[model samples]
Target: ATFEIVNRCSYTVWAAASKGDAALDAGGRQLNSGESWTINVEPGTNGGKIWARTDCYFDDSGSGICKTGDCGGLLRCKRFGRPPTTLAEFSLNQYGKDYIDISNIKGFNVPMNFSPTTRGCRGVRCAADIVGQCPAKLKAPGGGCNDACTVFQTSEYCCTTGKCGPTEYSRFFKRLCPDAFSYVLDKPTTVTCPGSSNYRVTFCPTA
Candidate 1:
């Protein structure tokens, strides 16, 4: 299946992706406004995640930094992006279904939309203006909003062990973006579709 990455923002963005063992395609490439890239995934490519990096500055060697969603200063992104990143996650062909979600559990940097190319598959998004409205304590160093687990790190906010429920902090995020996964145990965030569906991911999608 092909996962199309689209940049609808007025500025440039660096996109990244990761899956087990395999390095990402276009992992750190600069995507200008309205540019799009597509990566073909092998069947049963489960546990892959993709995200966009904002406010980036890289040289020819691709060694620089990003204001948000830095991947350890590596262009190829051998690991996951830093916190306060909007994540597009997927589990393809698992139990005869494709599972997808836009997760803000690490908190949100950019607005994003995820939709299946095939009809009848539900789309999901988190397009709220979180950065402008982020709580003072939960604001990221550069931009975006940090999750309660990242800010407080307490058992209550992280749901580290026993049963836990949403708090005022998690509720704050959920209220803005009802479809996103705002907390560790956030429910009903995953959208399941048929395994054959391709997907489109757009950054800064229009209302």
Candidate 2:
């Protein structure tokens, strides 16, 4: 699948991808303001995620720390990034259709937009100012907003024990980004696009 990652944020952002060993641009690539990079996904790839990392400093080997969205401190990762991250999850040509979702399940660091280049495909966005409005109980230090699951880690928040449902906290995220997957069971968030469609994922997309 064809893809492009663009950074509209004032500062730089490092994009990340996972769920398969396929290293997306060596797992991370820095995108400065007004920069865009193209990438390709192997066909039939299923169950993958894309996200952004912020406030980072890495050695030449790509091992370092990030204020948000750190995946084992590696520039290239097969592991999921740590939480308090805005996420874009996707499946390409699964059963002849593509599916995607923007999520705040782990909370938001940057605003995002993911859309297909194919005609008639709908785009999804989570462009709310979550960091500024985040509650004290679920705020990450320095930057980003933490999900309640990351903060409280209870059945009510993390689904640690078993079945759980949305709380006022999840509702807060939903209200901010209506298209995002706000809770564990939020299904209305799923959006479908035609198989084989090329796509673009943008950070700090305009409202």
Candidate 3:
């Protein structure tokens, strides 16, 4: 018997199958938008898992991650195990009409520092010295005041030595949210299409 696999998630989903735990590795491939594939089975029992991944890489040390957005740091891929128990597992019995939707996958939200050096109003140098209110030195980047490398407020200056190190304003940004590929289960699904079950899938935000 054969079953139809449909991708109904807001994004693409990667599907993999295995008769056992080690066979799970073969399902690492992905499924693209509105695409469907068929898996042949010998009228027995089978199990598999599906997952999704974001497009981003952490810094050299893997300590930080980057993306096209203004995210200040790295974004980590959501760690997911086998499918959620609540979802129904695919079965060959429903072949010729059964459809499997992997749409309910939830994403994880990751946070990071989002400070930019240009946020200081362009020419407004925080290290400028004012006769009475200004200090001598400024705070350095990632200093105690903020993550930025410049300092401007007079209150931040040294009281005794009157020195202010480079101090800049630091801000935070929320990176990817709900970062998981979900599945959708609907009716009228059929897998009479042609071709090997092999597929390649990609994911992206709807926005």
Candidate 4:
């Protein structure tokens, strides 16, 4: 399958992904407004994650911390980056359908959309101005919104146990992006489509 990482924001975003062994774009790439990066995935690829890194400054050696999603200050992330970032995960299901979700369990850096671009597949997005409308307590040093779990670090928001429920903080996100994975154990808002379909990740998408 193919994936297009599309950057529509006015500013730049350095894109990153996990599960590089499966041919995902693990090494981050810089994308400015209206620019895009593309990559392919194998048939068995699973548990793959992709996201955009905002407010970053990298030198010739790829040495700089993305203020929002810094993967240990390295350009090409070998694993998941820091918090206060949105994520897109793909799982090739046992059936012929593939499961995809635009998630915000970590936090929100920019608005996003994960769309299966063909067939009868549905799409998921959280295109609200989270950065501008962020809750006061969940605000971060960067321009992104921080998850309550990352800000408060308590089981009530972190869901360290199995029974943590929604709170006012998590509700703030859900009210805007209802389809998003609002918090831990939040209803899995995964969308399914044919596995053969390609996908597009749009940052700062309009409705």
* Per-model TM against the reference: 0.94, 0.95, 0.27, 0.93
Q: Model 3, poorest ten-residue lDDT window?
A: 121-130
Give the best candidate by lDDT: 2
Off by over 4 Å in 4: 20-23
What local lDDT does model 1 show for residue 201? Answer: 92
lDDT at 114 for candidate 3? Answer: 11
Model 1, residue 106: C-alpha shift (Å): 0.1
TM-score of 1: 0.94
Per-residue CA lDDT of candidate 1, range 81-160, in tens?
88889999988899788999988888899999999988768999889899999999998879888888888889988888
lDDT of 1: 0.85
Rank all candidate structures by their TM-score, best first, as comma-separated numbers.
2, 1, 4, 3
The models' CA-based lDDT, in order, is: 0.85, 0.86, 0.26, 0.83
**lDDT tens string, model 3, 1-207?**
343444444544443344333333333334566565555434433433333322334455433322221122313212222211112233222343222222222111111111111122111001111112212232211111111121332444212244433222211100111111121211222222122222222122121
Q: How close is candidate 2 to the true structure, as a TM-score?
A: 0.95
Candidate number that wins on TM-score, 3 or 4:
4
